[PDB]
Design a protein around this ligand. Structure first.
Ligand code: CLA
Ligand code: CLA
Ligand code: CLA
Ligand code: CLA
Ligand code: CLA
Ligand code: CLA
Ligand code: CLA
Ligand SMILES: CCCCCCCCCCCCCCCC(=O)OC[C@H](COP(=O)(O)OC[C@@H](O)CO)OC(=O)CCCCCCCCCCCCCCC
Ligand SMILES: CC1=C(C#C/C(C)=C/C=C/C(C)=C/C=C/C=C(C)/C=C/C=C(C)/C=C/[C@@]23O[C@]2(C)C[C@@H](O)CC3(C)C)C(C)(C)C[C@H](O)C1
Ligand SMILES: CC1=C(C#C/C(C)=C/C=C/C(C)=C/C=C/C=C(C)/C=C/C=C(C)/C=C/[C@@]23O[C@]2(C)C[C@@H](O)CC3(C)C)C(C)(C)C[C@H](O)C1
Ligand SMILES: CC1=C(C/C=C(\C)CCC[C@H](C)CCC[C@H](C)CCCC(C)C)C(=O)c2ccccc2C1=O
Ligand code: SF4
Lengths: 161, 188, 40, 47, 741, 183
């Protein structure tokens, strides 16, 4: 398709890797007798291996000459699921985390004992901040527009140049 | 000098409290567990064990005779059979909800809420509503439950030892003569 | 579960361990139910 | 299914053996959950 | 009199001081103002003498902490027994010990880790263990899983009892300092009561449960048919059938016809040919004799009754011309200061761990443990590391005593004063010894490398060019070999086959073999001595120069651990005894690493291996130690490079976990170098830049972040360095030995 | 001898919710005392939201087994399977509409601190009352208590239907018939 790689479903090296893993598992299967927990666990494991390989074949992943999936991170929407959608998911989650932390810090700084609140978390309001950080992109934008996000630098400690 | 009314050769301990704060105080505590553990906790455990032993011995005796159509197991194998079926999981779940609430009550009682040792307030039918009968009924509850612990222990142990259904008595006790007077031999 | 023990459970390390425990369990259960997800 | 009382009896009489000799100690100790190897291996949770 | 005297309800039971984090110290109780507060809360957690001045309170805290630790240890014994009960193949191994790989751990299938449940024989998939617990249980006589389950439950009960005891002895009835300072009665009860009765009880257990079960197992009776221990305990007819002397009862004991018990109480020596381990009758006689010895020793010190010794008088009576007042004041020092006792006890514990490591491999005590090559290597290496760590802890707490609890009014003109008054001579002479020993021992290796690279084997310090034979070690080995006839006539075999004698072998694998000593052994032994001497130099200098030095006359005022005393005097860096320990830990690490490398290579090349029916002795590496251990190039090639194959090629196999841990320990060892080489000033400035970045966004924390203190940075670097190195060696040894042996 | 016990449980102390003016406050059912930690107004808002959602959901669950939209793609009486069977765009549009509704109804009030800042804001009173049942103040207490109780019963009931269909693999009343069938 791209970069000289081929789809994993039509990849002879990918099929041989699957066959080799299957043969390895079946070879180690000889030690255990039929019906034992170890035998059934190995049967489950080989089923899982075959299911994994079939899923990679169906998903449209590209396999190189080495016969392993290669993720194309260039922004093409054919391979969006490789990076772009996981990237958006992580960015949303990390924003949630940082907004919860920042908002709880803003609450705690106004508390009578912020130093002790830093260690001992006020859990009832911490849960509220964590829940309310779900809408961080609009909340952060609102704080940006109102000017309550970036303190003016004329108000931050700075070392003698 | 106050001597324990159950063991008159031992002095009362001290941690047992005033003589009679607890119904049944016959001063029976030779090993002095009240020094290590608090009396309220010990008494909550006592009443829990009493009630559970009562229900257990009655259930054992009942299951020896009658069972529901689905459960076709004897009393001994009922535990394994209904774990395999899944009913004992349901009992554990619901009794665990009840026991979490109970544990919250024990925590509050020990920290000083005011709740008595085992007073859950369960009194729908109105037994013991009159304060005059309440102490007597507490003493009767304790007596019956403390008997029921030994009852259930004997039930289970004799049941497994003999293999007989209700009486938990050996075949010679049930069939032969346990009130004989003619000279016996080597075996029953 | 007095207010002091609730405060102790609210302390920073206990809360860190509890939350990271829940997070790791969440990740591991997502792995069990949707295993081998080298894609979306 | 068998609703107890509606489409089936309620309490059903149990099956019982009419007396018997004492089972040997090793007969039930070897099957007990705590003093048997197989009993210990079977005395585990399930899911 | 020696008496029980305790205060009742000294401390209330409440979670308020759980909530208050830094309550224990006056400075920490204020609350945080910087992140260094958080670190100091952990650093000063168990520094009881800094928290409270009362020696009584310190002793009570220590006593209950000991109880908590014993609870943890009982939970650990419980985990071992319970995992053997449930998640193991102990029955299969008991049936077929030689072929079955012992395993008592199972991973769950989640993210592909299920391969780590490798083929361990016995129809069981799991992680192979190397702790020797299977052999321990076989020696103890455990033949079923119900026994393992029930002893695990007993261990849990004991752990609960220990937690209860720790709570009770601090919150309800705490002893007094008068009770704690009864050292004479403590020694009496620990000798006769703990050690003596422990040995007596274990001897009884062996004689009654271990000898019959193990003898039947060696005969061939499968574990199912073995009579149970309760049957064996009282069935005297069966015990007479097995050991005929039992039919005579205890009359041959009460009368002094102890020779009648010769069958089950022996001085055979050597190793049992069947199991390739020590005779259990020999072990029973051993423990009985030790029980008698300890009970005899425990009746020495004075108590409520007139008989007994006073350690004060014994010490005060020992004073010589070259020692002045002698041992005067040491009784009071060791009765008043916990740190001095901790120092002595840690030193002896560490030396005992090392002696254990040396003894177990040469005299395999448990059945089928000698053939279990991973077990021997793992136990030896582990006990060596624990011993080194304990020795450095001993040095650290000696330094702590010197800084805090030392006093000239007490220790005037005694041995401590006289040692401090010529510490300079001591350290200078040890410095010369270290230079001489290191120069010779390492320059012999370097010479060998130089001549080999110059193509001059005839100029080597080899076994055939210039021999450095350990004549004295060879003489001692010969004496031990000839001992069973001349100097130990009642012994029927040598104490250990390492000195000499026959080649003990179980199945094809070799249990024990005579270990030859040549030029390579001479060189590596002198290397060991050099490393030990440098470690002693660092630690002894730290202990002696904790009070003061020519550089800092008032070093005691600064404290035990402090960063420095400024850049003055050209630099006063790491002057503290704490920093001396920090440097000595690197050196004991090097010492133990070289010791375990010597052990691994020597046992793989000269002892471990296989012997065929004719007697073709084939070793794991092939005897390459005697000719390749003469050069550092040979050490790098034939030991590290040669044996790293089984680690690096472990991916895709059950040892792939060892491969991952190999890499991770490498990573942590390298990560440590950041802390070890870098300094707080740079890190604080970097944190200032990051704090500006946070303050620009209105989220700079109330607890201001700070770079770690200097002592903390040194500690973190040392901890990461030790973890990385030890984990690297751990993964390497385990992967190599499990793959090849 | 508890001075102020919970009404629901006389053996437990009164939670903060019991001494409150919310509808259903005269029950005191809070063994875990989550009203002390959680703001009671926020908790009641969430309670009513979940109850409303689930008392829509129970009716949807029972009636999806019997009735279908005429010729709707991917119908299955088992709603669990029917979710996957049905077009994803239908559920996407439904979720988008509900997101719009929630956003517009809770504009600038999505958090514990942000919401209930205004004193007039009542828990669950999102202004939705076209028919104006609340203007008749006599029946307002009845309707509020009824909403609360029916929402609670519906949360429980929807859990029941969902997990019963998980157990059996058949829809709700099919499984009910199989239970109440011949031995
Ligand atoms: C409260 C959360 C919080 C927030 C909002 C930020 C924000 C920031 N940090 Mg980070 N930081 C945090 C905690 C946080 N930090 C902590 C605890 C540490 C100590 C380990 C650091 C150490 C640190 C360094 C050394 C640097 C940053 C940098 C940055 C910036 C880039 C984002 C980034 O790469 O993060 C990196 C994130 C980390 C290294 C780890 C974060 C730790 C956890 C996962 C998050 C903490 C959440 C907290 C527990 C929430 C409690 C709330 C709850 C009670 C409701 C940005 C200003 C960089 C910068 O200056 O860029 C301009 C930078 O160089 N941070
Ligand atoms: C300690 C208490 C206890 C425990 C742990 C058990 C446990 C068990 N019983 Mg039960 N049982 C008990 C008391 C107990 N029982 C009592 C007091 C009775 C007399 C009414 C019964 C009557 C009984 C019967 C008739 C049967 C069981 C059976 C069983 C098994 C399945 C659960 C079931 O259907 O229970 C049913 C329990 C009840 C109907 C009693 C409910 C009332 C409780 C005690 C609360 C009362 C206060 C409110 C299980 C092993 C079944 C089995 O497997 O038999 C072989 C079965 O057929 N039990
Ligand atoms: C929803 C299904 C259902 C229905 C409609 C019935 C109906 C009946 N059962 Mg019941 N029963 C059921 C489920 C059901 N049962 C279940 C699940 C169990 C297991 C615990 C039992 C166990 C059981 C027994 C052991 C007996 C009955 C009996 C009866 C009959 C006597 C009525 C009575 O005394 O009520 C009394 C009910 C109450 C006082 C209220 C209890 C229930 C509420 C909701 C609490 C009645 C026809 C009796 C019978 O067979 O008579 C011929 C009988 O002996 N049932
Ligand atoms: C025969 C009597 C006896 C016995 C068996 C012990 C045993 C013990 N004492 Mg000792 N002790 C004794 C008399 C005795 N003591 C007397 C008379 C005094 C007063 C002078 C002390 C004062 C004393 C102190 C001050 C301390 C000990 C501690 C210990 C433990 C040492 C660590 C160890 O190896 O634990 C081995 C553990 C076991 C073998 C498990 C057995 C557990 C119980 C006994 C069952 C050990 C459990 C230390 C401690 O607190 O550790 C917890 C400690 O600090 N003892
Ligand atoms: C602490 C260690 C220890 C212990 C506990 C024992 C225990 C025992 N040894 Mg000894 N033994 C030991 C060390 C020990 N030994 C050592 C070091 C040696 C080497 C010198 C020997 C050498 C030796 C020999 C050669 C023999 C024993 C034997 C015995 C038994 C003696 C019985 C007796 O004297 O009752 C003492 C009785 C009392 C103090 C009176 C109280 C009685 C109580 C109430 C009875 C309780 C019974 C019990 C709970 C229930 C059993 C029921 C049954 C149906 C199962 C007993 C099993 C004999 C034996 O049986 O060998 C198999 C035997 O021949 N031992
Ligand atoms: C009998 C054993 C023993 C005892 C009772 C003590 C007791 C004490 N030591 Mg210690 N010590 C010991 C052994 C012992 N030591 C050993 C073997 C060493 C040599 C390394 C030391 C070296 C040492 C020093 C140098 C100092 C002490 C100090 C102290 C005191 C305070 C310690 C504290 O609060 O730590 C609280 C506990 C911690 C801070 C946690 C430590 C965590 C370590 C570093 C890492 C653990 C890694 C883990 C095992 C593996 C991680 C795996 C990874 C994959 C996650 C206290 C009196 C201090 C003192 O007296 O100051 C005045 C002090 O400066 N000790
Ligand atoms: C390979 C690395 C290395 C080396 C070579 C040394 C060397 C030394 N350390 Mg160690 N040390 C190391 C790593 C090393 N250390 C590390 C990483 C640390 C940090 C934890 C320390 C921390 C440390 C401390 C704190 C102490 C030592 C001590 C010593 C000395 C031991 C005496 C000795 O045997 O000297 C002899 C020299 C050698 C063994 C090197 C090889 C010598 C051969 C014969 C070559 C000769 C060459 C020729 C004559 C000259 C050059 C030829 C030509 C170019 C002119 C010595 C200077 C102790 C000391 O002072 O001892 C008295 C001491 O107290 N070290
Ligand atoms: C190697 C170092 C030897 C030189 C330093 C030893 C100097 C020494 O410690 O002083 C001499 C000292 C003995 O001194 P006294 O007899 O005065 O002391 C006996 C003490 O036990 C009483 O305090 O030790 C020995 O004799 C050891 C001899 C080296 C063996
Ligand atoms: C009181 C007390 C306590 C207690 C207690 C105890 C021990 C209480 C015990 C209560 C007990 C033992 C209660 C059993 C109920 C059984 C039921 C409802 C059975 C349902 C059965 C059903 C629904 C069905 C059965 C089936 O066979 C049917 C009919 C058809 C077949 O096709 C198969 C199936 C399986 C489907 C505390 C909390 C410990 C402490 C406190 O201090 C005091
Ligand atoms: C109090 C109140 C109200 C109320 C109320 C009411 C009626 C509440 C009712 C709650 C109710 C009815 C709650 C049921 C829970 C059931 C559970 C958790 C079952 C688990 C079942 C499980 C985990 C089953 C598991 C298994 O099947 C598996 C998977 C396979 C089998 O091999 C084994 C078994 C069988 C074990 C009002 C009146 C509505 C309003 C008022 O204002 C306030
Ligand atoms: C890296 C480094 C730091 C910076 C490293 C720090 C402050 C450690 C960070 C630990 C925190 C608690 C993070 C742990 C992981 C989680 C994000 C929490 C120092 O402060 C320092 C001080 C003195 C000598 C050497 C060094 C040093 O090497
Ligand atoms: S770097 Fe550390 S040791 Fe060196 S002068 Fe500065 S503070 Fe002292």
């Amino acid at each position: 398709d791209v970069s000289g790689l081929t789809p994993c479903k039509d990849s002879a090296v990918f099929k041989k890797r699957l066959d080799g893993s299957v043969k390895k598992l079946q070879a180690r299967l000889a030690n255990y007798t039929e019906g034992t927990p170890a035998y059934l666990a190995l049967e489950q494991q080989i089923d899982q291996t075959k299911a994994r390989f079939a899923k990679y074949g169906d998903k449209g992943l590209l396999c190189g000459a080495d016969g392993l999936p290669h993720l194309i991170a260039d922004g093409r929407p054919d391979h969006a699921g490789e990076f772009v959608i996981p990237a958006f998911g992580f960015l949303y989650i990390a924003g949630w985390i940082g907004w919860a932390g920042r908002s709880y810090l803003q609450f705690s700084k106004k508390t009578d004992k912020p130093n002790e609140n830093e260690i001992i978390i006020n859990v009832p309001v911490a849960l509220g901040m964590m829940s309310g950080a779900f809408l961080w992109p609009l909340a952060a934008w609102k704080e940006l527009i109102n000017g309550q996000l970036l303190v003016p630098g004329d108000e931050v400690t700075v070392s003698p140049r | 000098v106050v001597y324990s009314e159950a063991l008159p050769f031992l002095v009362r301990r001290e941690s047992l409290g005033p003589v009679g704060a607890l119904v049944g105080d016959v001063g029976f505590d030779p090993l002095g567990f009240t020094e290590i553990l608090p009396l309220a906790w010990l008494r909550e455990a006592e009443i829990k064990h009493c009630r559970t032993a009562m229900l257990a011995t009655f259930g054992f005796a009942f299951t020896d005779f009658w069972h529901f159509p689905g459960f076709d197991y004897t009393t001994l194998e009922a535990h394994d059979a209904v774990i395999a079926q899944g009913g004992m999981s349901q009992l554990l779940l619901w009794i665990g909800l009840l026991e979490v609430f109970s544990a919250i009550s024990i925590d509050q009682m020990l920290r000083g809420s005011g709740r008595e040792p085992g007073d859950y307030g369960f009194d729908p039918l109105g037994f013991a509503s009159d304060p005059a009968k309440k102490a007597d009924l507490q003493m009767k509850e304790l007596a019956n439950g403390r008997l029921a612990m030994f009852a259930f222990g004997g039930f289970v142990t004799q049941s497994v030892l003999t293999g007989n259904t209700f009486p938990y008595l050996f075949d010679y006790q049930t069939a032969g003569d346990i009130v004989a007077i003619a000279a016996q031999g080597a075996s029953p | 579960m007095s207010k002091d023990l609730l405060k102790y459970l609210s302390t920073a390390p206990v809360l860190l361990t509890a939350w990271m425990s829940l997070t790791a369990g969440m990740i591991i259960e997502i792995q069990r139910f949707f295993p081998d997800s080298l894609s979306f | 299914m068998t609703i107890p009382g509606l489409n089936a009896p309620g309490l059903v009489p149990a099956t019982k053996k009419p007396a018997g000799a004492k089972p040997s100690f090793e007969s039930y100790r070897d099957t007990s959950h705590f003093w048997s190897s197989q009993g210990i291996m079977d005395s585990v949770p399930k899911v | 009199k020696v008496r029980v005297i305790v205060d009742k309800d000294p401390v209330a039971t409440s979670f308020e001081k759980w909530a208050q984090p830094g309550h224990f110290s006056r400075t920490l109780a204020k609350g945080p103002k910087t992140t260094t507060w958080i670190w100091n809360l952990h650093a000063d957690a168990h520094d009881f003498d800094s928290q409270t001045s009362s020696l009584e309170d310190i002793s009570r805290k220590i006593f209950s902490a000991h109880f908590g630790q014993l609870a943890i240890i009982f939970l650990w014994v419980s985990q071992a027994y319970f995992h053997g009960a449930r998640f193991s193949n102990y029955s299969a191994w008991l049936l077929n010990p030689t072929s079955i790989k012992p395993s008592a751990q199972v991973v769950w299938p989640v993210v592909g880790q299920e391969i780590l449940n490798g083929d361990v024989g016995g129809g069981f998939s799991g992680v192979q263990i190397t702790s020797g617990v299977f052999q321990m249980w076989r020696a103890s006589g455990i033949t079923n899983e119900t026994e393992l389950y029930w002893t695990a439950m007993g261990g849990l009960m004991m752990s609960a009892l220990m937690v209860f005891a720790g709570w009770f002895h601090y919150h309800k009835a705490a002893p007094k300092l008068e009770w704690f300072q009864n050292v004479e009665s403590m020694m009496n009860h620990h000798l006769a009561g703990l050690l003596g009765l422990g040995c007596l009880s274990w001897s009884g257990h062996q004689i009654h449960i271990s000898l019959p079960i193990n003898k039947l197992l060696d005969a061939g009776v499968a574990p199912q048919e073995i009579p149970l221990p309760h049957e064996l305990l009282f069935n005297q007819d069966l015990m007479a059938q097995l050991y005929p002397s039992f039919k005579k009862g205890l009359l041959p004991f009460f009368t002094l016809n102890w020779g009648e018990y010769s069958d089950f109480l022996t001085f055979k020596g050597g190793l049992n040919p069947i199991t390739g381990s020590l005779w259990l009758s020999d072990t029973a006689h051993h423990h009985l004799a030790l029980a008698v010895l300890f009970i005899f020793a425990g009746h020495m010190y004075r108590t409520n009754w007139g008989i007994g010794h006073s350690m004060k008088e014994i010490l005060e009576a020992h004073k010589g011309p070259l020692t002045g007042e002698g041992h005067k004041g040491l009784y009071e020092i060791l009765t008043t200061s916990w740190h001095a006792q901790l120092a002595i006890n840690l030193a002896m514990m560490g030396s005992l761990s090392i002696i254990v490591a040396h003894h177990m491999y040469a005299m395999p005590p448990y059945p089928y443990i000698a053939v279990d090559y991973p077990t021997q290597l793992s136990l030896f290496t582990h006990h060596m590391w624990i011993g080194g760590f304990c020795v450095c802890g001993a040095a650290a707490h000696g330094a702590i005593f010197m800084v805090r609890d030392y006093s000239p009014v007490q220790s005037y003109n005694n041995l401590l004063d006289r040692v401090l008054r010529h510490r300079d001579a001591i350290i200078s002479h040890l410095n010369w010894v270290c230079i001489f020993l290191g120069t010779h021992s390492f320059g012999l290796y370097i010479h060998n490398d130089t001549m080999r690279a110059l193509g001059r084997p005839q100029d080597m310090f080899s076994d055939k060019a210039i021999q450095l034979q350990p004549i004295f070690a060879k003489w001692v080995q010969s004496l031990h070999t000839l001992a069973p006839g001349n100097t130990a006539p009642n012994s029927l075999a040598t104490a250990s086959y390492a000195f000499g004698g026959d080649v003990v072998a179980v199945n094809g694998k070799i249990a024990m073999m005579p270990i030859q000593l040549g030029t390579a052994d001479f060189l590596v032994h002198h290397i060991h001595a050099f490393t030990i001497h440098v470690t002693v130099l660092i630690l002894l200098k730290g202990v002696l120069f904790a009070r003061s030095s020519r550089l800092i006359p008032d070093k005691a005022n600064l404290g035990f651990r402090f960063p420095c005393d400024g850049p003055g005097r050209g630099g006063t860096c790491q002057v503290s005894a704490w920093d001396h320990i920090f440097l000595g830990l690197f050196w004991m690490y090097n010492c133990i690493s070289v010791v375990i490398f010597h052990f691994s290579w020597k046992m793989q090349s000269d002892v471990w291996g296989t012997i065929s029916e004719k007697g073709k002795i084939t070793h794991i590496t092939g005897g390459n130690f005697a000719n390749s251990a003469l050069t550092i190039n040979g050490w790098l090639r034939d030991f590290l490079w040669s044996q790293a194959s089984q680690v690096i090629q472990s991916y895709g196999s059950a040892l792939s976990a060892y491969g991952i841990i190999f890499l991770g320990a490498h990573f942590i060892w390298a990560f440590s170098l950041m802390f070890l080489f870098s300094g707080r000033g740079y890190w604080q400035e970097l944190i200032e830049s990051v704090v500006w970045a946070h303050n620009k966004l209105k989220l700079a924390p109330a607890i201001q972040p700070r770079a770690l203190s200097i002592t903390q940075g040194r500690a973190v670097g040392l901890a990461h360095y030790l973890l990385g190195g030890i984990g690297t060696t751990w993964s390497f040894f385990l992967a190599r030995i499990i793959s090849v042996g | 001898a508890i001075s102020k016990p919970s009404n629901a449980m006389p053996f437990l102390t009164a939670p903060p919710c019991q001494s409150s003016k919310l509808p259903g406050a005269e029950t005191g059912f809070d063994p875990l005392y989550l009203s002390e930690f959680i703001d009671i107004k926020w908790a009641r808002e969430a309670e009513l939201k979940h109850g409303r959602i689930c008392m829509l959901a129970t009716v949807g669950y029972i009636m999806q087994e019997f009735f279908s939209l005429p010729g709707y793609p991917g119908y299955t009486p088992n709603p669990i399977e029917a979710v996957s069977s049905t077009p994803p765009e239908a559920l996407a549009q439904i979720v988008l509409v509900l997101s719009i509704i929630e956003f517009n109804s809770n504009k600038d009030k999505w958090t514990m601190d942000t919401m209930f800042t205004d004193p007039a804001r009542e828990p669950g009173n999102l202004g939705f009352d076209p028919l104006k049942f609340g203007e008749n103040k006599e029946t307002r207490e009845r309707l509020a208590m009824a909403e609360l109780k029916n929402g609670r019963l519906a949360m429980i009931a929807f859990s029941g239907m969902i997990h019963q269909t998980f157990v059996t693999g058949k829809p709700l009343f099919a499984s009910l018939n199989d239970i109440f069938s011949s031995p």
